[PDB]
């Protein structure tokens, strides 16, 4: 579970494990795929997707997911998590605002991202309905058995941990997690690399002038922009994405039927939608003479139909056609 710098972490820029990168309000189904720097899913070892492993300290905390909250302008709905990554059904929102509850603390993370949800169709809803026609939307999956893409996930760079740099009663005293690789020296001249167990520091004294580092590359990370490079190498760790964008047919929009009214080679149409509906036509002469107008306000319109025919498209309701001799 990677940890990075959340931008407006409740107060201001903290370093949250759930630091939000790559917000994708690019689908249609009320859904956003998000990456936390935290890797929830199974535990550290082997069990139960529905548990929760973020970083506390240098360490993980692979425990229950109890009170996740993604949210935006309104509280979102989770869809599924896998890896670093969560899918959640959100409404539109100027921002994105994520957070669980460990239990002692709220411990959330928030971010800017322009979000919208147009459904696919000539109706510009704000939200998916219960009914209407199905038609080919873009949307992310529920599932994990997924390989359609993979993002590079090589090592972490080092990280700071000044909990290490204690004092040896006059000298600044570094320690190690588990024998991990601590990269160490101070502004003064003393040990210059640091690949060690718990060292002391002969020369410097102040904690604030030393290299508290953790080369702990036993587990790779996501290659966040808010990661410091592991300077050594491009290690392996090519790793999939679960939530591929797929060609789901969203349960989708439908605009109320029109009121057809006859006139001489002319369609008066008293019209009354639910939401802004893009109407348009095609006078089937080799003179096309089409028309487009989003209609949200109910409006009686007109169409000079010709002899050979016109067609009529009340939103994603199917196209009509008309003989006006």
């Amino acid at each position, epitope marked *: 579970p990677y940890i990075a710098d959340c931008p407006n972490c409740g107060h201001s820029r903290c370093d949250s494990p759930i630091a939000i990168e790559e917000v994708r309000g690019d689908a249609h189904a009320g859904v956003i795929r998000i990456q936390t720097s935290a890797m929830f899913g199974l535990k550290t070892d082997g069990v139960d997707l529905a548990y929760m492993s973020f970083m506390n300290g240098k360490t993980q905390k692979s425990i229950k997911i109890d009170n996740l909250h993604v949210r935006t302008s309104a509280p979102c709905s989770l869809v599924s998590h896998h890896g670093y990554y969560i899918l959640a059904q959100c409404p539109p929102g100027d921002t994105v605002t994520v957070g669980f509850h460990d239990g002692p603390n709220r411990h959330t993370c928030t971010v800017a991202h322009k979000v919208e949800f147009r459904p696919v169709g000539r109706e510009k809803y704000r939200h998916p309905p219960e009914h209407g026609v199905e038609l080919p939307c873009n949307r992310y999956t529920h599932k994990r058995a997924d390989q359609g893409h993979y993002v590079e996930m090589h090592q972490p760079g080092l990280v700071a941990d000044h909990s290490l740099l204690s004092i040896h009663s006059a000298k600044v005293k570094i320690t190690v997690p588990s*024998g991990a690789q601590v990269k160490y020296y101070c502004k003064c001249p003393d040990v210059r690399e640091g690949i060690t167990s718990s060292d002391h520091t002969t020369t410097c004294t102040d904690v604030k002038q030393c290299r508290a580092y953790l080369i702990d590359n036993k587990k790779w990370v996501y290659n966040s922009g808010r990661l410091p490079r592991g300077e050594g190498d491009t290690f392996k760790g090519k790793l999939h994405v679960p939530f591929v964008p797929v060609k789901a047919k969203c349960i989708a929009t439908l605009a109320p039927e029109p009121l057809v009214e006859h006139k001489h080679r002319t369609l008066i149409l008293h019209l009354h939608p639910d939401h802004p509906t893009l109407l348009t036509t095609r006078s089937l002469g080799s003179d096309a003479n089409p028309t487009r107008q989003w209609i949200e306000r109910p409006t009686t319109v007109n169409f000079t139909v010709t002899g050979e025919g016109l067609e009529y498209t009340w939103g994603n309701h199917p196209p009509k056609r008309v003989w006006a001799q």
Partner: nanobody
Amino acid sequence: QIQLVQSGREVKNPGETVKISCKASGYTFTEYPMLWVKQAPGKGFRWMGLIYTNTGEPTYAEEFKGRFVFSLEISASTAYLQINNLTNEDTATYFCVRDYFISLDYWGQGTTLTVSS
């Protein structure tokens, strides 16, 4: 059903290397990785790391990153522990173990090393 049978106990003078085998039986090797635990004479039980028997990547406990190297004869359902440049305070018993069910479910018999000139 599941049997993890380990090599027999060795004697080695300081400085030497040892390769301890763990031959797995009863499960599909590949869906369950291996835990290596050190139970030192007095001290009790300690996790030495885990090896992904699928990819082959090892995790070492920080106490064990360095002289210790996990590897596997995949092909024969064997996992192995290799301790190089043996230190005298490495005398102890090492167990292989199967990680499953949100913990460890089966332990091996143990291979005891006595580092001694």
